[PDB]
Symmetry: C4
Subunit: 458 residues, 4 copies
Amino acid sequence: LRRRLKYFFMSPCDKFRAKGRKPCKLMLQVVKILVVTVQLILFGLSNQLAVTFREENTIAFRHLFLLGYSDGADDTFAAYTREQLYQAIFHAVDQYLALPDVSLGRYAYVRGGGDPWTNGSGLALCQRYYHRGHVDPANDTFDIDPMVVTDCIQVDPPSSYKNLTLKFHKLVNVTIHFRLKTINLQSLNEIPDCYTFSVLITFDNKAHSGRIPISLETQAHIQECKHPSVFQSFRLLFDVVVILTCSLSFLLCARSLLRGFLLQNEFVGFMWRQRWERLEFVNGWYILLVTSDVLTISGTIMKIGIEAKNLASYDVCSILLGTSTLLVWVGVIRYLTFFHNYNILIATLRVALPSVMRFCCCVAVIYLGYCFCGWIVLGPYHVKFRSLSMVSECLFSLINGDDMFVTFAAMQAQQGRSSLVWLFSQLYLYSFISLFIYMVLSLFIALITGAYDTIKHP
Amino acid sequence: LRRRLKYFFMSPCDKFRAKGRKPCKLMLQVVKILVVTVQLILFGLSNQLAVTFREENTIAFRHLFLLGYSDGADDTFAAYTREQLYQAIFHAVDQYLALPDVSLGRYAYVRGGGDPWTNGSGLALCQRYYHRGHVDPANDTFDIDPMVVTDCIQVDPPSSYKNLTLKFHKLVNVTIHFRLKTINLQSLNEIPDCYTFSVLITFDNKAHSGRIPISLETQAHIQECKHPSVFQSFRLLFDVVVILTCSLSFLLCARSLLRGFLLQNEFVGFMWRQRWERLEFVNGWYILLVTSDVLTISGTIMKIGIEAKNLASYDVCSILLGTSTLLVWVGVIRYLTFFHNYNILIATLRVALPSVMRFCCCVAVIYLGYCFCGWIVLGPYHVKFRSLSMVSECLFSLINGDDMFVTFAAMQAQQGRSSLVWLFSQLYLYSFISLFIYMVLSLFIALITGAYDTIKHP
Amino acid sequence: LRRRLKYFFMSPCDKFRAKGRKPCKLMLQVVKILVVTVQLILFGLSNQLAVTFREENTIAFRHLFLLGYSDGADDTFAAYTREQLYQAIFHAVDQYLALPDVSLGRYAYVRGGGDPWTNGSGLALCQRYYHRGHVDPANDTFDIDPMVVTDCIQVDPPSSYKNLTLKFHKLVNVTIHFRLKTINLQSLNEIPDCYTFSVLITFDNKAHSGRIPISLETQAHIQECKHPSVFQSFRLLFDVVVILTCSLSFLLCARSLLRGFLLQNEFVGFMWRQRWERLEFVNGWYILLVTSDVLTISGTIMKIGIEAKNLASYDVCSILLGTSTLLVWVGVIRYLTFFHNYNILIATLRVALPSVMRFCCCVAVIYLGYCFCGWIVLGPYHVKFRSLSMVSECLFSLINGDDMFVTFAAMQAQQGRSSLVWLFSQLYLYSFISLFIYMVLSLFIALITGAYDTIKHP
Amino acid sequence: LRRRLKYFFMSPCDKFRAKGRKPCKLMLQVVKILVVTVQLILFGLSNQLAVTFREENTIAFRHLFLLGYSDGADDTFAAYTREQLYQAIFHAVDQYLALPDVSLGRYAYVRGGGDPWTNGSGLALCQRYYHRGHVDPANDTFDIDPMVVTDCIQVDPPSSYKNLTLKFHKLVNVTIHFRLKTINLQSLNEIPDCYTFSVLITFDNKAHSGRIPISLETQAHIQECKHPSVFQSFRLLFDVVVILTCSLSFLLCARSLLRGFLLQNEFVGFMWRQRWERLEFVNGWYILLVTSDVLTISGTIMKIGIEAKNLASYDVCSILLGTSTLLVWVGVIRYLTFFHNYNILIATLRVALPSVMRFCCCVAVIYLGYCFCGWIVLGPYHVKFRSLSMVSECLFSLINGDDMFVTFAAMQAQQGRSSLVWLFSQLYLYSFISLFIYMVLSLFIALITGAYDTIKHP
Ligand SMILES: CCCCCCCC(=O)OC[C@H](COP(=O)(O)O[C@@H]1[C@H](O)[C@H](OP(=O)(O)O)[C@@H](O)[C@H](OP(=O)(O)O)[C@H]1O)OC(=O)CCCCCCC
Ligand SMILES: CCCCCCCC(=O)OC[C@H](COP(=O)(O)O[C@@H]1[C@H](O)[C@H](OP(=O)(O)O)[C@@H](O)[C@H](OP(=O)(O)O)[C@H]1O)OC(=O)CCCCCCC
Ligand SMILES: CCCCCCCC(=O)OC[C@H](COP(=O)(O)O[C@@H]1[C@H](O)[C@H](OP(=O)(O)O)[C@@H](O)[C@H](OP(=O)(O)O)[C@H]1O)OC(=O)CCCCCCC
Ligand SMILES: COc1ccc2c(c1)CC[C@@H]1[C@@H]2CC[C@]2(C)[C@@H](O)CC[C@@H]12
Ligand SMILES: COc1ccc2c(c1)CC[C@@H]1[C@@H]2CC[C@]2(C)[C@@H](O)CC[C@@H]12
Ligand SMILES: CCCCCCCC
Ligand SMILES: CCCCCCCC
Ligand SMILES: CCCCCCCC
Ligand SMILES: CCCCCCCC
């Protein structure tokens, strides 16, 4: 029992000396790292092209359909007069009708097939307003039924829409919906696939502020083209190989975990006979490996489905595959732990981690207090403090010494509007930054240094 | 006396074991944190909408009334010729007269009601110049009576103002004042309130430099609309709940403080009989809690007043509520002090703090010297060094390693204009940054590390 | 001798106890700090207005005289065709002739008074080209006499200049020179002074590259107006007070230094009788104070001269006064050295300084090597690496973690043009940053920590 | 043998005392540093002018030939309609034909001389499309022969090209090729050399996305002009001097290395008679010096060739000379090692280096995992995460606290598009930055501090 236990805790070289078994798990893990990384690289290279295609088409659509659009204007693009809004709407519809003659791309029209389109219509120009909308600011009176009514004109591909009359006082928004079909030629070494872009142009008046932002958005539905012919299954084979490798690694790691648990039970029983501590038998690296195996297998199944155009959940698949790749590359640290000079460093980090996490809790409460205060006080005056997540991002960047002067300068242009708020912002920023840079970061350094001293001088 | 004293200093668990009293203050403080944070979140969410409404309306006004205005041009927007100035003024007035036909918002005119408007006038176009303004640079002569005369034209809502004749040589400024009434519809789940925007357009010639900056500013007066009807008091109840919670906490903390003071007096008297040290009986956490309670109660009273449209002091109320929320979240640290592993870190910070503050004084004198020198020498040549507060912000950012290269690059464009100043700027910046990064920050680290060693090895 | 020596080294409180002399030097130094700081603040506030006036006038000139100018275009403003250049020149001259009718400022013309103007001329339009300039790139031939000929047209204030014929193939540059007189009215609480702006517009063809940059520059000559009359000497009195205070402090510090030297001589002689070490008698704080006094007196004399319009050397005066203010505020540290808890920190810095400077030399050689390498290799491809001073600024900013991603991104757009250079840039940047952040800054921290330990545990 | 060995390891001063030989190598190394640095400075100053000339000419070409071009638009400059593309092409060709009349530079046409030009043609306007290109997105069908056909029109210098008909549906790209000859006059104190700019304007449709980017690129071929005549060999002599100095240093260092090896062999043999450790006889500084000598000699030979216009490999020559200069300036550290106080610091760095490199490996695996995960997950949504090298640059900048807030803000505008991806980005960024700033950098500091303590307290 003592000998078996001592064998259970030997290093790979010691195990090889003791029993001579060729280490299959280590070579399997190396092969796993290689194949998982290659799969991720190929997947990312393939996804990059599709992302570029979608983005380029969307930029072209913005230039084609948004009157007076220029690059970099997305956030501020808006209308401010009734004639501006009418001109933008009519320009978008006219450009839709002129597309085959003017566009550098090759687009096919799509008709019908559900709402908001009718059977024969390619473009839907829809206006949404309030059911009852009496508003008289002169007498400070209003009578509103907030129920939204939609009235929408249908345009067939090549002027009734030219008679649009907007209900400005009760207008909620205006939308233009249409679909364009194109073939992704640049895929050529894949076979070109068929894209359907659904384009939505929104003129948004929900704020009722006299400023109506204009935006264009696209959703791309990708399918296989019916009759592809390019003059003159390794990906699937590689996915199968990855799945098989991860399954074998999973089985071996599960067997190791089960044997460890059995030895733990035997040891506990023997000690009870003779007479947190049990987790010593749990190999955390194997738990990490099993988790990465499961993530990789799920992600590869989803990747197979996506590459066949049967699925479109890119986000979840990418998150699974990326997290698993991160996990395997982290697990590479296990190998370095077997050599004394590297183990010194890894053990220092391990012994430091608990106190680092506790201090992280201590820091978290103070940080949250500062976040709330800054959001309530500075949010009305500072673009970086509008929302709580933005406030947290700004404060975290300040801790790391990024974007500090611009944060101060934004407040600089309020010293006359509100002296009290400017003074408060000075105190708030200086105190936060000084406390975190002089004291908190220094304490993290001290914790790591103390851990290192403990490791070096037991 | 020894028993009572030792009880006074026990931890909550020890006190519970000793006397069995259910801890009311701890649960009360947890509930207080919850309710104060929720109140702050609701208040901030409500204020965000009003801020957005005001800002969007002001952006729309800039686009409507400022001839040739574009986003991002606020700081440089100016006129440089007499025809430019006349065109800007006349465009603003014409747009005011055309507003009902062109604007995407719904605005009502406001007439009369005090200065600068006369009884029936909606817009005031006022020109301010010097009483006597003879200026003859050809002979280097001038005869100025600096008393400002105001001549102002009155315009009724739907062209005498077209006959404006500006006294350019003695002109101080030109202003356009008018008020617009609108209803904030997007409040819909509140009831829409009625806004009166007072719009001031300023053409500023106080520098007499040939460049006249143009700006537009708004003040919003919010009130309840007279006849609001939306087809089909929890906030006030929550405010009352917060006030009650804070009052109960205040009473309990005050009782604890008074009992501590009484025990302190008894101990001092007994020691005097037998025979800075007194503050040991003062519970600082309770002083913090009492301060937080007072701030929260004041801020909640102000918040109740504001939400009824009876008050408009958003800045003070927000500062009070935010500071109190920061204080309660900081006071959460007291709970962590009860567990040994967290108390190690908190005690390290506490023991470090005095020396950190002393070194802050030492740093302050040197920092102030650098601020003064940089302001006097570089201010004529560097945008970041124009005022003392700006100089301090720039230097503090440099200490934290932000905005360093742009600070150097601004000086790069003067190596030919003044070699001496460029060389001085090199020495100044390099010496300041090197001194603060190699030595000062390192000493803060050393202070924290020494405190940690003292705590870990008593 | 022992008693006198021990008295010479006592602290101010010990000296006061020993002999009872009221400390005049300390109160004098406090008063000096106050008066010098107030003088600097008043000087800077006064110089800010003049700087703003000059800059605003120059911006107005750019908008008035440079065809198609817009804010932020200074660095890229250039002509690229012959008609563009002709139009820019003629627009500048026409605007000069139209100035009284169109400008928002009030400017008087200046005629004659030296070169390049003739007696009756207000504007000089001068063209500089090569004496002999045959250039024939078709046959790869050229015959050039590089001697510069200047031909310049004279324009009187209100079209011979319209017949300008530029020698494009041998053109060196074109310049427009003219002077405008204005009165600085915004000085009103001073008396307005008279400004003469000399305006130089340069069309620069020295690169002969097909691109001719266009710039406008001004020199302002300020004088007192002949007949100033504003309807209804404390600065000079304050300057005299500052000079007197600094002179008294200088005399007292010099007396202290002389007495210290005398005691040093007596001690050395007595030791020689009985039987770097001498500098222990030198009070470094008094050397600093004497330097500050001298700088302040010189700067105040220059300030008096400048404020009377008898001098125009603002740079030297500002450098003197700012450096002296920095020195006095640094000298404030002497007072903190008298209290033990502050002396701990100051002594830590003092004991650390020698090793910090030695490591600075070690760092300097490696830093200079990297600067040379980066300048030679990356300068052809990277805007931040064009000159050696720019390279040093970029590397120093990288050490402090500023502007790092943009430095990488500029190189990103060369991975195709030159793979070798891009790879070298990767190695260069990563190695430099890693070496300086992991090792150098850490060693500075270690030096400070070791000094602190030595001070705390003698 | 003991005496000779002890002499081999003495310092220069000890060797001078022991044998009196005047140290030739040290003075030679000082002279080498001086001459190598001067050579590098002169070379860089000369290269700067050529770089500026090429860049200015290219900017002029962009302004002359690209319709509607403005500075800073290089990355987004593109066409979006067929008429836009036709206008850009025709404008470029028309400007080429009008160049002598409109350009501010002096350019000669180049005719024929290889492809794509025919014998008498100066400009080649070439269109590249697919051999067979049927694309019908309406029926989701396509028939493509991806073989590229080039059809190109030839234009002689002063309209057949006006009849260009683009095959938009199968268009791959359009290119305009032409060469211009100019003389670099600003070289005047060199002799002007003759430049041939080959200009390529690309209209790129490889993405087939409806957006066609437009770019202009130049290659400069520099030669000596046939008949240079400027009215009224030190560089080569200096290059020869540098080569001779480096050769002498190489010979002396090689002799020292050989003698060290001989002594090592003798010691090993004697010890074997009596009875990693051998490298103690290897002087690493001499290996560094020999490497720098070789690099300098190669770079100087290439520099001589380049300055004669016989070579054009600026990149390799610059890399060689810059690396050698960096190496000699690093080797300056050897001299500081001879003085005890500097040797303390250098020895601290030397003893720290092995553990620093080991921890660098440990950090590398985790860093690579994060790089892969970020590339796969965020690349579709974040501009900074498009490629792996860009991801690494972004993460490395984040470690150093640069460009943090903008990285967060780019993700901020996806909280609605994909909540899962935004949450993942929050976790990813916060965890990465916290781990590297609290723990990794702290451990580097601890390693350096421990090394320093070991050096200071043996
Ligand atoms: C539940 C069934 C799981 C699958 C069958 C498992 C059969 C199986 O492990 O045999 C031993 C070898 C090596 O397997 P491998 O896991 O590389 O080797 C084991 C580990 O080294 C383990 O230590 P840790 O890694 O630290 O836990 C050690 O205790 C075991 O010795 P012990 O038995 O004396 O305790 C080894 O046998 O395994 C293969 O070579 C698998 C590939 C070929 C067969 C593939 C069949 C699909
Ligand atoms: C001035 C009047 C103040 C209000 C009345 C005070 C009556 C009152 O405290 O009773 C004890 C409990 C618990 O009150 P609470 O403050 O939670 O409990 C006390 C604290 O634990 C205190 O320690 P520290 O917290 O460290 O100072 C301890 O010394 C006291 O024991 P001791 O007396 O033996 O010294 C406790 O009684 O209090 C409630 O349960 C209030 C809510 C219900 C009643 C609300 C009435 C409005
Ligand atoms: C393979 C042939 C190489 C060239 C001839 C080499 C002849 C040669 O070194 O003579 C000694 C002096 C000084 O040469 P230099 O290298 O400055 O001096 C030697 C080094 O100090 C060496 O120590 P390290 O530097 O630590 O290795 C030391 O061991 C030798 O003493 P030892 O002999 O007792 O062991 C010295 O002679 O050298 C010149 O003064 C060269 C310039 C004048 C001659 C130029 C002729 C082209
Ligand atoms: C305009 O004059 C100033 C403006 C700011 C500051 C000072 C003087 C002097 C003390 C400074 C403070 C900014 C914040 C600090 C640098 C703290 O981090 C430590 C000392 C502080
Ligand atoms: C253009 O060449 C330069 C330009 C600057 C510097 C050097 C060489 C060499 C010494 C450097 C200095 C910049 C500032 C430092 C990095 C200090 O922080 C420590 C050593 C200094
Ligand atoms: C079993 C030792 C600890 C390993 C846990 C996994 C680290 C990521
Ligand atoms: C009484 C112990 C110290 C607590 C003071 C409050 C800390 C914010
Ligand atoms: C005489 C003690 C040292 C003081 C020198 C001046 C410090 C700036
Ligand atoms: C032989 C001592 C070490 C020197 C190696 C070179 C350092 C760059």
